[PDB]
Amino acid sequence: MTQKFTKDMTFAQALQTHPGVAGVLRSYNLGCIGCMGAQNESLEQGANAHGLNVEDILRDLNALALEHHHHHH
């Protein structure tokens, strides 16, 4: 079992995989990826650059792929 969102893939690919990723990234201070040109950069690279752990990021991003988790009951 692999992950549709991995630390190896680039921000540009993630955004084009699920538009909701943009909201997650911007919420995680990773919104600047468009300005700093981190589009061609891997998720883990931008993560450490902003002092974050890619593990927690992949967690919430992959949740966008499953869609089974509801944020409101």
CSV table of N, CA and C in Angstrom, one decimal:
chain,number,residue,atom,x,y,z
A,1,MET,N,0.8,-1.2,0.0
A,1,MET,CA,0.0,0.0,0.0
A,1,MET,C,0.9,1.3,0.0
A,2,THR,N,0.8,2.0,-1.1
A,2,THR,CA,1.6,3.3,-1.2
A,2,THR,C,0.7,4.5,-0.9
A,3,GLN,N,1.3,5.7,-1.0
A,3,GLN,CA,0.5,6.9,-0.7
A,3,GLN,C,0.4,7.8,-2.0
A,4,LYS,N,-0.8,8.3,-2.3
A,4,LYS,CA,-1.0,9.2,-3.4
A,4,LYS,C,-0.2,10.5,-3.2
A,5,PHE,N,0.1,10.8,-2.0
A,5,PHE,CA,0.9,12.0,-1.6
A,5,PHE,C,2.2,11.5,-0.9
A,6,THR,N,3.3,11.7,-1.5
A,6,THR,CA,4.6,11.3,-0.9
A,6,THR,C,5.6,12.5,-0.7
A,7,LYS,N,6.6,12.3,0.2
A,7,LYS,CA,7.6,13.3,0.4
A,7,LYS,C,8.5,13.5,-0.8
A,8,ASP,N,8.5,12.5,-1.7
A,8,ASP,CA,9.4,12.5,-2.9
A,8,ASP,C,8.8,13.4,-4.0
A,9,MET,N,7.5,13.5,-4.1
A,9,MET,CA,6.8,14.2,-5.2
A,9,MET,C,6.9,15.7,-5.0
A,10,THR,N,6.7,16.5,-6.1
A,10,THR,CA,6.8,18.0,-6.0
A,10,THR,C,5.5,18.6,-5.6
A,11,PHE,N,5.6,19.9,-5.1
A,11,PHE,CA,4.4,20.7,-4.8
A,11,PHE,C,3.4,20.8,-6.0
A,12,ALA,N,4.0,21.1,-7.1
A,12,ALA,CA,3.2,21.3,-8.4
A,12,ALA,C,2.4,20.1,-8.7
A,13,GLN,N,3.0,18.9,-8.5
A,13,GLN,CA,2.2,17.7,-8.8
A,13,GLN,C,1.1,17.4,-7.8
A,14,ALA,N,1.4,17.7,-6.5
A,14,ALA,CA,0.4,17.6,-5.4
A,14,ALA,C,-0.8,18.5,-5.7
A,15,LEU,N,-0.6,19.7,-6.0
A,15,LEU,CA,-1.6,20.7,-6.3
A,15,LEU,C,-2.6,20.2,-7.4
A,16,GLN,N,-1.9,19.6,-8.4
A,16,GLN,CA,-2.7,19.2,-9.6
A,16,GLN,C,-3.3,17.8,-9.4
A,17,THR,N,-3.0,17.2,-8.2
A,17,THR,CA,-3.6,15.9,-7.8
A,17,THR,C,-4.9,16.1,-7.0
A,18,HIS,N,-4.9,17.1,-6.1
A,18,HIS,CA,-6.1,17.5,-5.4
A,18,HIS,C,-6.1,19.0,-5.1
A,19,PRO,N,-7.0,19.8,-5.7
A,19,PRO,CA,-7.0,21.3,-5.4
A,19,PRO,C,-7.1,21.6,-3.9
A,20,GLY,N,-7.7,20.8,-3.1
A,20,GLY,CA,-7.8,21.0,-1.6
A,20,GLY,C,-6.4,21.0,-1.0
A,21,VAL,N,-5.4,20.5,-1.6
A,21,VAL,CA,-4.0,20.5,-1.1
A,21,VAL,C,-3.5,22.0,-1.0
A,22,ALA,N,-3.9,22.8,-1.9
A,22,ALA,CA,-3.6,24.3,-1.8
A,22,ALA,C,-4.0,24.9,-0.4
A,23,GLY,N,-5.2,24.6,0.0
A,23,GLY,CA,-5.7,25.1,1.3
A,23,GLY,C,-4.9,24.5,2.5
A,24,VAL,N,-4.6,23.2,2.4
A,24,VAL,CA,-3.8,22.6,3.5
A,24,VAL,C,-2.4,23.2,3.5
A,25,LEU,N,-1.7,23.3,2.4
A,25,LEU,CA,-0.4,23.9,2.3
A,25,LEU,C,-0.4,25.4,2.8
A,26,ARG,N,-1.3,26.2,2.3
A,26,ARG,CA,-1.4,27.6,2.8
A,26,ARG,C,-1.6,27.7,4.3
A,27,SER,N,-2.5,26.8,4.8
A,27,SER,CA,-2.7,26.7,6.3
A,27,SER,C,-1.4,26.3,7.0
A,28,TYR,N,-0.6,25.5,6.4
A,28,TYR,CA,0.7,25.1,6.9
A,28,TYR,C,1.9,26.0,6.6
A,29,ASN,N,1.6,27.2,6.2
A,29,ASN,CA,2.6,28.2,5.8
A,29,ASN,C,3.4,27.9,4.5
A,30,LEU,N,2.9,26.8,3.9
A,30,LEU,CA,3.6,26.4,2.6
A,30,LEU,C,2.9,27.0,1.4
A,31,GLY,N,2.1,28.1,1.6
A,31,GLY,CA,1.5,28.8,0.5
A,31,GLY,C,2.5,29.6,-0.4
A,32,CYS,N,3.6,30.0,0.2
A,32,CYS,CA,4.6,30.8,-0.5
A,32,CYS,C,5.3,30.0,-1.6
A,33,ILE,N,5.0,28.7,-1.7
A,33,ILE,CA,5.6,27.8,-2.7
A,33,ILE,C,5.5,28.3,-4.1
A,34,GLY,N,4.4,29.1,-4.4
A,34,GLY,CA,4.2,29.7,-5.7
A,34,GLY,C,5.2,30.8,-5.9
A,35,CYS,N,5.5,31.6,-4.9
A,35,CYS,CA,6.3,32.8,-5.0
A,35,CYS,C,7.8,32.4,-5.0
A,36,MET,N,8.2,31.6,-4.0
A,36,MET,CA,9.6,31.1,-3.9
A,36,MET,C,10.0,30.1,-5.1
A,37,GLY,N,9.1,29.8,-5.9
A,37,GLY,CA,9.3,28.9,-7.0
A,37,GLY,C,9.5,27.4,-6.6
A,38,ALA,N,8.9,27.1,-5.4
A,38,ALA,CA,9.0,25.7,-4.9
A,38,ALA,C,8.1,24.7,-5.6
A,39,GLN,N,7.4,25.1,-6.7
A,39,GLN,CA,6.6,24.3,-7.5
A,39,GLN,C,7.3,23.0,-8.0
A,40,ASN,N,8.5,23.2,-8.4
A,40,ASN,CA,9.4,22.1,-8.9
A,40,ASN,C,10.2,21.4,-7.8
A,41,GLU,N,9.8,21.7,-6.6
A,41,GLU,CA,10.5,21.2,-5.4
A,41,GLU,C,9.7,20.1,-4.7
A,42,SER,N,10.3,19.1,-4.1
A,42,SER,CA,9.7,18.0,-3.4
A,42,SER,C,9.0,18.5,-2.0
A,43,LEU,N,7.9,17.9,-1.6
A,43,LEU,CA,7.2,18.2,-0.4
A,43,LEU,C,8.1,18.3,0.8
A,44,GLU,N,9.0,17.3,1.0
A,44,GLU,CA,9.8,17.3,2.2
A,44,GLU,C,10.8,18.5,2.2
A,45,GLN,N,11.3,18.9,1.0
A,45,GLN,CA,12.3,19.9,0.9
A,45,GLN,C,11.7,21.3,1.4
A,46,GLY,N,10.5,21.6,0.8
A,46,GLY,CA,9.8,22.8,1.3
A,46,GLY,C,9.4,22.8,2.7
A,47,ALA,N,9.0,21.6,3.2
A,47,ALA,CA,8.6,21.3,4.6
A,47,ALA,C,9.7,21.8,5.6
A,48,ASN,N,10.9,21.1,5.5
A,48,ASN,CA,12.0,21.5,6.3
A,48,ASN,C,12.4,22.9,6.2
A,49,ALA,N,12.3,23.5,4.9
A,49,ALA,CA,12.6,24.9,4.7
A,49,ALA,C,11.7,25.8,5.5
A,50,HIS,N,10.5,25.4,5.8
A,50,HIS,CA,9.5,26.1,6.7
A,50,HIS,C,9.5,25.5,8.1
A,51,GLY,N,10.4,24.7,8.4
A,51,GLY,CA,10.5,24.1,9.8
A,51,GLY,C,9.4,23.2,10.1
A,52,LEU,N,8.9,22.4,9.2
A,52,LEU,CA,7.8,21.5,9.4
A,52,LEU,C,8.2,20.0,9.1
A,53,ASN,N,7.4,19.0,9.6
A,53,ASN,CA,7.7,17.6,9.3
A,53,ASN,C,6.7,17.1,8.2
A,54,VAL,N,7.3,16.6,7.2
A,54,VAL,CA,6.5,16.2,6.0
A,54,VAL,C,5.5,15.1,6.4
A,55,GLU,N,5.8,14.3,7.4
A,55,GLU,CA,4.9,13.2,7.9
A,55,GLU,C,3.5,13.7,8.2
A,56,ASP,N,3.4,14.8,9.0
A,56,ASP,CA,2.1,15.4,9.4
A,56,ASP,C,1.4,15.9,8.2
A,57,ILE,N,2.2,16.5,7.2
A,57,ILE,CA,1.6,17.0,6.0
A,57,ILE,C,1.0,15.9,5.1
A,58,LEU,N,1.8,14.9,4.9
A,58,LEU,CA,1.3,13.7,4.1
A,58,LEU,C,0.0,13.1,4.7
A,59,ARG,N,0.0,13.1,6.1
A,59,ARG,CA,-1.1,12.6,6.8
A,59,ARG,C,-2.4,13.3,6.3
A,60,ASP,N,-2.5,14.6,6.4
A,60,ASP,CA,-3.7,15.4,6.1
A,60,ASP,C,-4.0,15.4,4.6
A,61,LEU,N,-2.9,15.4,3.8
A,61,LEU,CA,-3.0,15.4,2.3
A,61,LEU,C,-3.7,14.1,1.8
A,62,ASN,N,-3.1,13.0,2.3
A,62,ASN,CA,-3.7,11.7,1.9
A,62,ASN,C,-5.1,11.5,2.4
A,63,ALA,N,-5.5,12.2,3.5
A,63,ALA,CA,-6.9,12.2,4.0
A,63,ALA,C,-7.8,12.9,2.9
A,64,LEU,N,-7.2,13.8,2.1
A,64,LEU,CA,-8.0,14.5,1.0
A,64,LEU,C,-8.3,13.4,-0.1
A,65,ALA,N,-7.4,12.4,-0.2
A,65,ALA,CA,-7.6,11.3,-1.2
A,65,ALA,C,-8.7,10.3,-0.7
A,66,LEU,N,-8.7,10.0,0.6
A,66,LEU,CA,-9.7,9.1,1.1
A,66,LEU,C,-11.1,9.7,1.2
A,67,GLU,N,-11.2,10.9,1.7
A,67,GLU,CA,-12.4,11.7,1.7
A,67,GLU,C,-13.5,11.1,2.7
A,68,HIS,N,-13.2,10.0,3.4
A,68,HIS,CA,-14.1,9.4,4.3
A,68,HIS,C,-14.3,10.1,5.6
A,69,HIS,N,-13.2,10.8,6.0
A,69,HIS,CA,-13.2,11.6,7.3
A,69,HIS,C,-14.0,12.9,7.1
A,70,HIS,N,-15.1,13.0,7.9
A,70,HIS,CA,-15.9,14.2,7.9
A,70,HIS,C,-15.5,15.2,9.1
A,71,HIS,N,-15.2,16.4,8.8
A,71,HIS,CA,-14.7,17.4,9.8
A,71,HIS,C,-15.9,17.9,10.6
A,72,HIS,N,-17.1,17.6,10.3
A,72,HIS,CA,-18.3,18.0,11.0
A,72,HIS,C,-19.3,16.8,11.1
A,73,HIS,N,-19.8,16.5,12.3
A,73,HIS,CA,-20.8,15.5,12.5
A,73,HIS,C,-22.2,16.0,12.3
